[PDB]
């Protein structure tokens with residue numbers, strides 16, 4: 001079995017294991033702040049430096065993975081708390097879209113909301129152009145921010161949210177369990193064929209963004225990950 | 233929302249929140265030992281005392297849950313390491329089958345391997361009578377120990393195993409992530425309609441068993457659980 | 465070469481290869497519980513029955529050794545989690561100090577913290593009388609519980625900790641590597657001359673203790689050992 | 697704390713986590729064969745793809761590490777069993793020396809035996825030009841194959857050897873424990889200042905080589921590694 005596993009309880013600038021793209025910043029307390037509160041259309045993304053081989057062309061096997069992380073979003077004054085965070089899986093050469101407008105693209109797609117990635121979003125702003133639900137929500141995105149499936153949710157300012165994600169290679173099911181701070185859990189599951197949507201080697205990470213009038217603190221506090229590919 | 237959540241880092245024998253059935257015994261270190269090493273066809277089960285309402289007849293809503301626990305199985309001399317542990321969901325009036333032969337029934341079914349429950353088994357012995365796979369395995373059981381679906385696994389004596397289970401009400405998907413001792417993860421998922429297989433109120437718990445020649449240490453070390461039923 | 469090697473994956477009460485002193489008790493799962501949770505100044509120790517010859521008077525040779533074990537400490541209610549575990553090397557006639565007060569003496573020293581032994585401690589309580597650091601720590605003790613050298617550490621209740629110790633005869637260096645639950649490793653090393661501090665034949669083992677208000681579960685789960693003395 | 701940890705029980709071609717350099721080959725059983733038995737001056741090296749940051753320029757902290765691996769060397773007919781294996785730590789841009797003559801350079805140094813690396817060698821051939829001891833031996837190399845310190849050892853054809861290495865940041869002590877096939881352990885320790893000899897980011901790996909007349913099977917069977925840098 002081919003297994004990749006890591007665990008970050010705090011992050012630091014200068015760690016070869018992590019790739020920073022955009023307005024990312026590592027705070028003194030170990031937290032990663034994804035966007036710059038003073039920039040227009042700010043976009044920040046952090047990825048695990050090492051590419052993970054999620055499926056094999058030789059055997060046709062797809063890996064299963066278990067990951068869990070925790071974030072926090074907080075309101076800053078005079079601005080609309082937007083736009084949110086997205087845990088994504090993209091090709092190994094992934095870069096922030098060329099003329100990114102930040103905002104509702106969450107830093108992973110273009111103006112129409114298209115991109116090459118699969119991910120779980122925690123959207124705090126309703127962009128009608130992307131057919132966003134009228135409330136905050138968690139959604140599964142497959143090559144687009146016009147979510148394949150969404151579930152109502154509620155982002156609480158200053159609250160530490162915990163998430164657990166399991167992807168079963170067999171059923172190709174991606175399930176998410178979000179534990180809010182009030183104790184209640186929110187779940188969403190969807191069948192996604194990683195092998196048909198992504199290349200053999202990909203990179204996992206987080207991305208967040210804002211606009212001109214929408215800005216808020218997007219923090220990543222911890223992240224653990226484990227994937228196992230059955231080699232034959 | 234109607235939420236039920238508990239967390240046990242250690243168990244104790246005078247806890248009204250726990251029901252002991254069979255040869256269960258609480259060791260001095262807080263662990264629960266499910267079977268009696270010196271009893272033939274030994275069977276032991278532990279259940280959360282309070283019935284959890286998983287579905288409503290009024291709204292037709294089914295609850296979503298997130299639970300994780302860790303156990304350890306260890307070999308004892310001169311005996312075949314058998315038969316295994318099962319995390320199960322059963323009617324609130326659940327009792328050890330009358331005249332249980334222990335062994336391959338895992339303490340939840342009758343001689344043919346039938347019963348009323350839904351669970352995830354960690355089977356360490358191949359019972360051809362229940363169509364068991366030729367290796368150790370994790371399986372999803374629905375009213376029978378002839379698993380609806382199994383995945384090969386490997387039970388390491390004296391190793392602490394961690395499991396995480398997520399059941400998404402919408403897709404009715406039950407997914408399991410088992411983190412072995414060597415870091416490798418094993419997963420299995422299956423669509424199970426709790427509302428059609430179980431009553432409105434059920435009890436969650438664990439069960440293990442042995443035979444005449446098959447006996448081993450079955451321990452439960454910790455258990456956290458959280459379920460949320462949307463009431464409206 | 466004169467080599468002594470053994471490996472315990474589980475312990476049992478009628479084993480002539482093991483000496484039990486004090487409140488030691490072997491649980492049904494194979495684990496050794498060093499202290500009695502109901503006794504006031506409780507002290508329990510377990511030693512390998514056979515004396516190991518660590519140095520020759522003939523050829524001034526000292527033995528090199530590689531050992532690794534794993535333990536678990538857990539909080540019990542209403543009591544301060546104290547006092548800790550110590551892996552020690554002592555004269556073959558070693559016995560629990562006469563009139564031992566348990567507590568910060570860790571079962572190996574007198575009231576002032578003096579004794580005849582060398583060992584690695586995993587201290588979970590700061591005894592100012594022994595100049596203990598203000599946090600949990602691992603320390604190297606040479607004839608006293610006022611550690612020659614300490615390193616900060618963190619004891620996690622119910623966590624299985626693994627340790628590996630290497631003593632290099634040439635450099636007389638004792639180095640320890642503690643693998644926390646967390647994945648993080650802690651190390652400490654110190655030059656200790658076994659030949660000048662201990663006699664030719666010694667006994668290896670573990671010891672733990674508690675006080676009136678300080679009590680917790682001290683468990684030893686496994687232990688392998690190999691020593692080689694060059695004879696020529 | 698910044699921790700990096702991985703565990704390989706078997707290797708595979710096409711794993712992004714591993715860099716193959718030279719005549720390396722992944723056998724069908726999962727073992728890595730470092731040298732080509734049919735090539736003159738054969739050299740093969742395998743490295744962990746991701747650079748590990750061993751020390752910080754910010755806080756003058758150095759990381760501690762614990763690693764253990766197992767190898768096997770086997771005689772092939774008509775050839776001198778040479779030249780050995782070396783576990784090394786080198787700059788992230790490390791490549792096989794231009795114009796390497798294999799043989800006694802072990803694939804990490806030039807003709808004089810100089811290079812930029814720190815490692816532990818398991819030398820099976822006495823090269824007088826590098827002041828090699830007259831017998832097989834384990835040695836600690838610091839920027840040269842003219843070992844800083846060596847200890848006699850004995851390579852047994854077809855025997856699986858296990859090694860454990862601990863580097864304690866504080867004392868800057870590197871200690872090695874080699875468990876031979878017959879149960880006897882061999883140890884060697886040396887104070888090495890990684891911060892003064894190596895850059896902030898390095899790569900860990902293995903290297904082996906042969907000559908025209910000296911060739912043998914050099915295999916790597918498993919490898920686990922964990923390093924922790926105190927960030928603060």
Ligand SMILES: CC(=O)N[C@@H]1[C@@H](O)[C@H](O[C@@H]2O[C@H](CO)[C@H](O)[C@H](O)[C@H]2O)[C@@H](CO)O[C@@H]1O
Pocket residue numbers: 080082083103104125127210211212213214215
């Ligand atoms: C100066 C100003 O008026 N700018 C806003 C833009 O910020 C706005 O874009 C959206 O803003 C919200 C937050 O208010 C979200 O971030 C959303 O994703 C953005 O699309 C655009 C469109 O409303 O219009 C005004 O210019």
Ligand SMILES: CC(=O)N[C@@H]1[C@@H](O)[C@H](O[C@@H]2O[C@H](CO)[C@H](O)[C@H](O)[C@H]2O)[C@@H](CO)O[C@@H]1O
Pocket residue numbers: 312314315334335336337357359442443444445446
């Ligand atoms: C004395 C002896 O040989 N008895 C065995 C039984 O223990 C055995 O029952 C099975 O035993 C295995 C372990 O070996 C499992 O526990 C299984 O569930 C049991 O059914 C029966 C049937 O094989 O036959 C021999 O008696």
Ligand SMILES: CC(=O)N[C@@H]1[C@@H](O)[C@H](O[C@@H]2O[C@H](CO)[C@H](O)[C@H](O)[C@H]2O)[C@@H](CO)O[C@@H]1O
Pocket residue numbers: 544546547566567568569589591674675676677678
């Ligand atoms: C009931 C109670 O308060 N008793 C305590 C003692 O337990 C205590 O002894 C020390 O206790 C700590 C744990 O809190 C360590 O075990 C220490 O080694 C013991 O000396 C004594 C002295 O502080 O006094 C109060 O009784």
Ligand SMILES: CC(=O)N[C@@H]1[C@@H](O)[C@H](O[C@@H]2O[C@H](CO)[C@H](O)[C@H](O)[C@H]2O)[C@@H](CO)O[C@@H]1O
Pocket residue numbers: 776778779799800821823906907908909910911
């Ligand atoms: C055909 C033959 O005679 N070749 C040898 C060389 O192999 C030899 O090189 C050394 O070989 C030994 C093993 O016998 C080791 O691999 C050593 O490191 C090599 O230097 C050279 C020098 O002895 O000369 C003869 O050609």
Ligand SMILES: [Ca+2]
Pocket residue numbers: 083104123124125126127132
């Ligand atoms: Ca949006």
Ligand SMILES: [Ca+2]
Pocket residue numbers: 315336355356357358359364
């Ligand atoms: Ca079975």
Ligand SMILES: [Ca+2]
Pocket residue numbers: 547568587588589590591596
């Ligand atoms: Ca103390």
Ligand SMILES: [Ca+2]
Pocket residue numbers: 779780800819820821822823828
């Ligand atoms: Ca040589």
Ligand SMILES: [Mn+2]
Pocket residue numbers: 121123132133139145147
């Ligand atoms: Mn959305």
Ligand SMILES: [Mn+2]
Pocket residue numbers: 353355364365371377379
């Ligand atoms: Mn089965």
Ligand SMILES: [Mn+2]
Pocket residue numbers: 585587596597601603609611
């Ligand atoms: Mn101390």
Ligand SMILES: [Mn+2]
Pocket residue numbers: 817819828829835841843
């Ligand atoms: Mn050499």
